Ligand binder design. Sequence first.
Ligand SMILES: Cc1ncc(-c2ccccc2C(=O)Nc2cnn(C)c2)cn1
Ligand SMILES: [Cl-]
Lengths: 39, 156
Amino acid sequence: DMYIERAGDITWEKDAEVTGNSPRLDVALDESGDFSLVE
Amino acid sequence: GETTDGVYRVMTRRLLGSTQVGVGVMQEGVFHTMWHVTKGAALRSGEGRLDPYWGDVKQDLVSYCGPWKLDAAWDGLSEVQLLAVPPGERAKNIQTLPGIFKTKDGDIGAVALDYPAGTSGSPILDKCGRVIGLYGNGVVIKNGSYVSAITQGKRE
Ligand SMILES: Cc1ncc(-c2ccccc2C(=O)Nc2cnn(C)c2)cn1
Ligand SMILES: [Cl-]
């Protein structure tokens, strides 16, 4: 049996750690809800 | 049980100790997660039961106690924040400019941040704190790293 536990409020936080890149990717989405890279 | 808005861990005891299988969003009395976290099963909050109301394996989304409530959309320009809730670790905001998933049916925001699979369902926010979608469904890239769609449901 799965259970839930509160972890926080949903808030924008100024001077959060700013990271990650912004890749543009050709993808396909199959009937099972799995994305794949189209090449 | 607990019906306050905010972000929640999704846990199981069916494995060793207590294992975090993902995360969700409680808004307007509705619990919002990704389908691959719960596989559509019921959930416990305290002594209370949360029953599935709506889901779609292809969208990889599921709502509990009521219909999908989250309707905000990435502007296609601005940074966003992943409210990551990793297993055993505190909720942490990570701010990023999303990339783009190009598909035959349209472009979708994408976030290139690496977290364990148990982080699936963590909400992605705009500058006003609105949930513009959930983290946890995407693709493994050349680097071995994971890039998640910004997955948003429809509100009726
Ligand atoms: C090998 C590997 N694949 C993905 C992930 C992962 C990383 C971050 C968030 C989510 C996931 C994830 O598992 N998403 C997902 C969607 N559908 N299913 C079945 C599983 C980590 N490691
Ligand atoms: Cl395409």
